[model samples]
Target chain A: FVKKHFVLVHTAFHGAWCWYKIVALMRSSGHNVTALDLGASGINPKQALQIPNFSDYLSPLMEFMASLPANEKIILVGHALGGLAISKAMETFPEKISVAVFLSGLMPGPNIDATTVCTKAGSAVLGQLDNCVTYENGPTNPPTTLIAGPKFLATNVYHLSPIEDLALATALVRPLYLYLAEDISKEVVLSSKRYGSVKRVFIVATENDALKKEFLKLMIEKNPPDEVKEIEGSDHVTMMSKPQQLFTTLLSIANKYK
Target chain B: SPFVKKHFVLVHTAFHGAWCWYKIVALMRSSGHNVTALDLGASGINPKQALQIPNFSDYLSPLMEFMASLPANEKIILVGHALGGLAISKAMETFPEKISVAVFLSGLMPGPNIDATTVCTKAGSAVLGQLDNCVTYENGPTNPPTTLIAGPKFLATNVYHLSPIEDLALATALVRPLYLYLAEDISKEVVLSSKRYGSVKRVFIVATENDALKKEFLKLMIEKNPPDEVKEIEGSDHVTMMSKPQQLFTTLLSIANKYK
Candidate 1:
């Protein structure tokens, strides 16, 4: 019986709600699980317009870690854009985490920017990423919060998901804080002792057209996780469409890592 | 103070799963309340194939089972969104004694022998245009069309006008085929009555600018089967649970307190 705590983080434009199925499965299997809504995402009351920087945007996660029991450690899982947030969390509090799992998420390397990561993946991804952002009603300052256009929703992210599910998600997508991505790209740097000390695994969503397999391979070659697993025919949102496979893999990982 | 420890049970729309209620569930729990969000047959992560669900009763089995297992002494505050309104009404009819109140969050409230599609047409909505555009047959030769599929494009346009682009994309890919039996004949057989259903206090919460469940259609529902109370959220879409979660949460919380 595995009794370890697991923290699930969602990618960009998603909240803790995305992990609903995974959480239910995990709890039923006798493990503790909690999915958190990051700053300005999911059901978190903070709007994108209110967040000023990565620190403020990630305060919920940071505070969550601080509130845990002193001797407790958790298995951290990050998906899509969630990779960056989990990575930063690992670096800041390495002792609080046991293993960090990246589910087809972005992993930044030494001196690498997130924008370059998207550009190298594919033109469609880069174009959609750019097209989704709107400057209208944004702050006048250099750094601004950007809202995604609803027009590109059906095509850009969920090419492999069901149509009805896509329609449901279109109603809940919120704004992304552009400055956080830039901050992680520019100011954040992982120390080998802090981030490298923690065990890491990468689960590649082979059919994720938005993130592209090429970028997944690039992250593998650059940072190199402790272990690698792949799920074929899953798009960006594997948790919703291909949850059974993801659930099995996660349970197995918990058994091994715990 | 009995309301301080109330339980809130959430039901989702036709295409959506429990994931859509993540925001409200978290908020309710944070505010010292108990909440449970259930995924209907074949929706969300329920594993069962949509074709496997033979009828509306099968699709609602998970919810029905949950309701059946509740303790007799405790009453639940039931909330439904979109197509979920129909499912919850059935529950209220079955176990009206265990329910405190039924809150329709921009959901349908079918009357006896009255069909939902007929109600939509009577309300003067353009929803049928998208249905005509998106609805397709699985078995071309089958009589009365045993299966129906909704296209992603029309689903996107009609349901998610204010949602984020990425979430819409994710939903388009995750939604499954809805068996025709659930809606093939949603007549008065699926509606609530004035005695049992009406005895349970009803609150109608309207999303002012919903495209899928148009504002006019929601008003029509209110006018036809008058609820005990009515509330409206301005600049909201069909999925008010997502577009305006905080406002919806506050409204439901207030209703729960008032009836408690």
Candidate 2:
């Protein structure tokens, strides 16, 4: 029974609130835990205003971790590109972290840059949706719809997701970087070399209903990590379709490290 | 004006002479500042005589003599390293009018009442033997043999860190041993008055990035000692004198400019 210490990081489109069910389940199972709203998205959607620059997001997070009384270890769980952010965080302060989990996420290849990850993961859909979406761009900030909308959600997210989850997600899901996927894969992210030392737990979500199933599969299967656990029971829309099941599997993964 | 104003008067520890600061004196003065790097009595060239002159006043006599020779009336910035920091600190209290600001660059900032026996038997006693109870001095009026160089890890971690590889080589050429003054508790007084020296402005540069003195631990000293100003050169090693002179000189200039 791996005992405790868990930190969850959501994907590009999701925020800390999305981890509510998982957080509850993990706590119920008796694990000390927390979920962070990384600067760009989440309940902290206006995070960009606070941070101003994307490059420095890790510094605040690192400082927070540094200031904490020394602990034996802390588990880091990052989904999609959040995995990349965790990677950078670990490099800056390796002593604090014990393991990193990449869930249905962008695991960049050695030479591959962040742009490649973005384009391969969610860029195409974003561009196509941007072409047809209609709403007046306000002030200096572009219309919010371009960054977050049904099309944007459907193309990259789990499509079979239920109406309730869809509504919650719509209310919570924020706009992603126009080049978010590509941006993460760029320099300053994980090199193929670094993954070897990191205790990586790969959570490969089943791709039965993904718009880009083949690409998602390719990303997961390449450069296989320490452990690759598949969620065969659900599709990409597992959170929307089966939030309980999604968290159930997640709890199981967290258990492995405890 | 009893205040002794010599540019950079570097004092040596136990058996050590003043030659340790030989390289630094030339380097600092070449860049345009008065510098006086010297040995204590009976240490380097004065090796045959008694190492220290008994009381605090006698210990500082050689330093006083050096101060007398310097061009009169010019303000001086004194920099002390290792045990030298203790000698300089005491001198500052006794001759408050003679010195300007004293910079304790990684010198032993111990608390009071830590007797020589406790300092030697304690878990940290391992540090004492490493400074080698020996020393040496250069062409001065008094020459003395002294303690050996400080531990290599101390050298690598505490001092000469910012110096170029070549400068490090230069340090290797100059380092000498030091002698043990009749072991008294330097740290004891520090703990008693809470180590309160007169309210003269002081600067403490702790090398945190270094392994020795563990940079993190220095935070307590900086806060408790109440430096007029504190600066941490992140990524800079402990021996900023050698490893990072440009950065250190810049800090010195800032402090000097503030006083002016």
Candidate 3:
């Protein structure tokens, strides 16, 4: 049996750089792994103002999905905000994805609009304290971009992770496009026929400070995944918090789905 | 004064940015020391492209700016890795008084007031022979490559052979294009002085297993214009920070204590 082709999608304010350890672990285990940065994130060479719409922000993954060879299905994995992007990909090219895995991601189903889940869930708390929020449009209007500050990362995201990983995030984290309600609503429409048809696995990061375990369980209760994997003491950034365990979990998911 | 926190300023080599020093940064910071790792122009997330940097000085703008911003009495322990060695040398000449010690991590340590581009050219050849696994951007037919980026294979097998596979994976994704300046283009870049740069104490740290920048060359360079001290990391690759981060940190701490 051939090993699976795992395509990783990064979260907001994070790039493919975040998956450095995971990518290596998967590849070392004789699997083909690829990680992508959303537009205006990582080193994709785009600014927040340039990405006006949600679809435009996720165009890189869409274009990449469009480029895949015929009949070659990939294991699509999304982390945090990256879940929304992969969830969209599941709708757009449902046939191309073998399985969809959400690692503490914003899992949206047909009933639950990701827009509501995103805006209502921890939106007020994040970026208010120490995280940087940019009002590219204007200060009076809704924000355009957001970046996780060092304090937020240390306390919430990388609390369980090594200090080096936290430092890496501080050095590499970029400002991601913060979609207005209308934009994400139009872009994040998922149908049961397409998105639900594919086998879904949700890896619940138990120790997540921002995207709490209750919130993730609430998401599961709303839309319900085919399988659920619980990681002990893992924070929001599961890959950094527990890279080896994340790798094994991904491997198992790929084997069962692929 | 010696008991106080020692300041460390890290500079990366070609095709590398400040990102390479993450491990060391954490180690030093946790010990209550101040550490600053700068993303030089066009490298890492600096936003400036290799071609956009007109001169060698422009490429070193980030480090220079940091140095110039410091108060006159402030002193730092400068650390340069691989090509970063040449960068710190340039910094030493310009701001010698600001630096307490210059540490070269298996880096190219060039002597004062001579043509240093030759050493760089030799380094270019030794590391990336025939530029086989290299991607070069040329200005025109007559001109040499204006910018160079190493392919994934070269990074994995040559530079990061002894490093963790994860770091190699990281480099494959994040390494950026670096400018390969001609002699005239890098006019007086690493030209140091005995009075200014030489006055400050210097330390050379050699990586034993570095094929890219060999041990013999480091020793020869040391013999030519000897440093105050020479320390070696056994079985370290060209990218010692990745392969031997803890050892590098241990040595650095010792250096910081002694130098201070």
Candidate 4:
């Protein structure tokens, strides 16, 4: 019964391609879907090691928000490091989002550096972003920085992805948001009420997850969000291995908030 | 993928079978825990019946079955609750290399000479002492009157302390009879064989506050045998398995994530 469409923004180090299957499935199910490749990741292919700051990386995602229909607020989905990008988007363009979904997304503790969350989440791919050679073997020709690195990629993401689909991922994974280490368990934005109006859902992928359950538990306890859906049968990256469940669950959630 | 490497085996206790962990087994497996919830003997939907088992070894047939069925290179973390904890302790003695970790959920402390009767006393459950209403076997063995779990009054007081109303109903409906072997204690034997169990990297006893054994008993075992870890289930009772599964699971996850 809602006319506004779904606005899909992938988190740090990933492009819109990751949402292709979901998009196809959602469209076939008769819903309009738009998938955007965040500026520094996916097609833009910025070098994770060479990036100067968070602003340059988040530029594309912020630009994509401006391009959305002025009249239509959309559903936002983010995973891992991408949560930072989405948060900024929500902060800057509050009216554009109908709801935000964090798919095992990093929920930053107030003032805690993004590096700490990235490290604690065991985002192995981030190391590849640190002065490493890209797949093309050049310094910065086509960056292969990872946000969720090789081991995680193999276990969570590749558990169900096609060979070709898995191959498309860059070698390096980097954080889209860089926070000062002192901030653990506080509101990140100065205006705490900016995000107050937004309805949020956290999909905790308990299976084969590298992220500690304590992190998710803390996130839920801190904000006391609308609902925390425990995906009883999902791993950290159900989008690839169990796409049907992923699509179906997301679809069901969209319908609820629609 | 990391979970695939870390074996998540659910070891059953005496009397109860693998089926007791059905809801949790399904849940853990779905979350990529790489779970192996198995029957100990005559319990569960096993081919053998409790009455048919002549002795303890016969009752242990299912445990052996589960051991043989595991992948040869599979390194597993053994989690046992109640009498099952004792069963897993003995299992670690036999298959030391295969066990990476041992988690005892309200289980008995290890001892070389302890048997079922002694363990029951230590656990402070007098269900065995007062079996007046139940039937006696040909060998003068006493059994609880019901074929499915303890009496309603006992369950009302002992179990479902933190469970939702619906789950309590489901537990009543799905409850099954325990194997006669539960009363047998070799719990002392299993606990005493510390050298065989030393290889276990972590041993966690998730004790509930209302548990008769109390924190002191867990500390005694930890001091005597020494486990790598121990966790207390706040506001939970002895039968936290059904009562506070989510909290229990959260603890399990917390402990596992540290090493994993």
Candidate 5:
């Protein structure tokens, strides 16, 4: 019965809309939830090319964090690439976070090299990833952005999810700008006293791909989260695959952390 | 005339509430048109369960309250969606003078002298849907069903099939129940008059892609309760505003200018 305030951050190419189901579930259960659309995502109107680095990509989350009452802290839930954004926010405003819940997403380490290849999902069909990769500078330059192609998304991302969700993703999915070293190296550092000191929980999608279940475990092992949980049928499309289980997991985390 | 920025009142369909009007309302208001989207009794965040509403009048409470609260001389273009057409018909009858025009966005228009439940029953039979997932609760096994809720399968296929999956997901997150079928508390039939409800100019916006209500039934609704104007949003689903918002808003603004 403890009413916990939660701030949900969507993965790359997603907006607050991605957390619609979980928001509904938590609200129905009498908990407070705020699902945010990161910059250039959802209906924010900014295109991915507008983001040159990851720091600029987090403007929306940072502004939200800045606006909070000094006394308030939230259960910060991040999905997929959204975990990186949360980690960044944690380093900047750790006191504002009660729990940093990473749902089988990339959990970058204190060192830049410790980060997983942030975007590429090796399991993707050979040329599908190539077609999705965008080199904003030029073909000869390193890839600067990535958007999910339908076949790769259907076969890899949302394979375990419902057709309705797959359709929604296809209709609203957008391209995400890839962060280069200047972005990660200059910005990805998290201090043990700040970001590391926050109560961290990682929930692995047992059927994960891209950010595979094993990959999530490896990241947790290196960084060592305060706690780790698992949800089955929750592939990379963690929330949409089994919204109820994710809600319950957060509910328990809220209770446990309290 | 350049453009008329008139006030617009929006009513939502069955199992839906004010949230359905986001795209349309935003578009209309952006162009200077004032808009009000209302949730009927027990619908949206009203917090009342469908079983608690006793009759059609009870379901129409929110619309009535808004209509009553408006300035006396202010007239609005009342737009209703799906079953919401029934609510508008009542409001038009109650305050015909206050309405500039009533538009039905693939809505259920009640013909003069036609019973409310009759059109609803017809709309229901046409969709026959995966009503397998739809649950009907009765006062007793022998009595008429008091309330009902459509399941995901029914919604995905029949109601929002043509709309974006995101909107479908939004609907899934927010859908409530239907209280239109009760035979006892439903003892009252929606009685409309040509002098009141029929006096207001009416327009029907056909969502050509709507699967829930068949084209034949739409023709029947039209033949029975003819509108002053007929508009078409060719690719829109049953929830026209959700599926084809640009066209819906364009159609609405055009109607607003012409009517005003």
Candidate 6:
């Protein structure tokens, strides 16, 4: 039996760089693994204004999916904001993905935007989210870019990451495409025929301060996943802080789900 | 005062990225100096695949972005290793006004008329002989046949002999293929003249002994593009930045002070 193929996605303001450790570990274990940056994020050389919508913002991940062979199926994994992109990918190419895994990420229900989902879930963390964000109103009427404030990065998102890795994130984090997450169109909906057809797994990061424990709990209660896994001592960024544990959980899921 | 705190930009060599400088960057930041390390093109965790970069300029996009974002009055100290030296040189030439000084650590030193390939060719036949052993593969029939990827055995033995075994293995698996097209005729556009490139101060740091780019090549580089000064680390190999970060850090700090 061959090991499964895995596609890794990064959260908002993060790129493929965040998956460095997991990618190496998985690849060395004889599995094919790939990570992609959404348009205008990470080291992708695109301006925020260049991507006007979620479709355009997620073009890279979409293009990557398009490039895969017909018979080749992959384990699609997304973190934080990246969950939305993979969820959309499931809608677009449902047959090509075996499992969709969300690691302390936003799991939006049908026709619901991420903002409303968070608000209705009664997330205490949502109160502090706006203060931690800085917006750039592009030449367009609505804002074009969203940059996570550096001052908030250490305390809010990466409380568990090492000082070196945090420094790396502070220096490397790019402005996220605002329109992708915010002001997204209702047409960008998850369908049961496609998105629901695939098996879904939710890995609740216990110590996460960004998404908060209540948010993860509410997401599962609303649109339940096929399986739920929990990791302790992990913050918003488990891939960096608790890589080995995260790796084991992902590996176990890939085997069981396969 | 030893020297006023200044920003230090660390550039990685072939098959390495910003992650390699984790130890040094943390140490430097703890000591109160700003440090930034960048991923060039497909190297490191950069999303761009190797085949996507048609030439050197495309690979250098992120570095160019860093330079463009710098404050107009701000000047930064640049430290580069291996292939990074050539990259930093290109940056200094492009934004000389923004750079305070450059430090080359076991790195390539380029001259005005000659390109990096020629410099390596002149370093001695032995270094070029190792290049011959590198594994070459084509992406596809329609793809450009110019990209070159070093074999793991060669890289582990030569490029990262002194590095920790775990890091060496990590690098061997993750390092992307080098796009030779970037260096094929780079000297033509990347040529540095005295008015711009020479005006900027440069220092050379050698690993004193070992594999990868040999000490002879290091000496040859200095002879051709003579640095303002030379500092040496004893018993260090190609990846001294990892094996002897403290010594490397001290040399960098001293250079910053003496020049500041």
- Clash totals for all candidate models: 17, 62, 0, 29, 0, 0
The list of candidate 4 runs beyond 4 A from truth reads A1-258, B1-5, B111-117, B129-135, B140-149, B179-192, B211-219
Candidate 4, overall lDDT?
0.58
Q: What is the per-residue lDDT of model 3 for residues A43-76, given as tens digits with 9 covering 90 to 100? A: 7767777887888889999999999999789999
Q: Write the per-residue lDDT of candidate 2 for residues B118-197, one digit (tens) a residue.
A: 33233134245444322344324374333334654456444445445433432332233444343443343222233344
Model 1, stretches more than 4 Å misplaced?
A1-258, B1-3, B112-117, B120-133, B182-185, B188-191
How does candidate 5 fare on TM-score? 0.56
User: Residue B160, candidate 1: how far off, in angstroms?
Assistant: 1.6
Please state the CAPRI-style docking class of candidate 6.
Answer: incorrect
Kindly report which residue stretches of model 6 are placed more than 4 angstroms away from their true locations once superposed.
A70-72, A111-115, A118-140, A180-188, A208-211, B1-7, B11-22, B36-77, B83-102, B110-203, B208-212, B223-247, B254-260
- lDDT tens digits by residue: candidate 6, B36-135: 8898998766767777786778777789889989989899999988778878888888898888899999888886655677764453244333643453
Each candidate's DockQ: 0.03, 0.00, 0.73, 0.01, 0.06, 0.15
Best-to-worst order by TM-score is: 3, 6, 5, 1, 4, 2
Residue B32 C-alpha lDDT in model 4: 64
Where in model 5 is the C-alpha error above 4 Å?
Answer: A1-18, A21-258, B127-132, B183-189
Pairs that collide, model 3? none
Clashing pairs in 6: none
lDDT of 5 by residue, A84-109 (tens): 78888899999889999988757877
Q: Which number leads on DockQ?
A: 3
- Per-residue error for B223 in candidate 3, Å, reads 3.1
Candidate 4 to truth, TM: 0.44
Local distance difference test, candidate 3: 0.83
Question: What are the runs in model 2 whose C-alpha is more than 4 Å off?
Answer: A45-52, A56-64, A128-146, A151-158, A179-187, A191-195, A209-211, A233-237, B1-260
Report the C-alpha lDDT of model 5 over B212-243, residue by residue, as the tens digit. Answer: 88878887888888899898988877888888
User: Residue B92 of candidate 4: its Cα lDDT?
Assistant: 78
Two-chain DockQ for model 6: 0.15
Candidate 2: tens digits of C-alpha lDDT, residues A55-148 = 5444435565666557667777777767666767666556666777777666665645556666665555446553332233355653333355
- The model with the greatest lDDT is 3
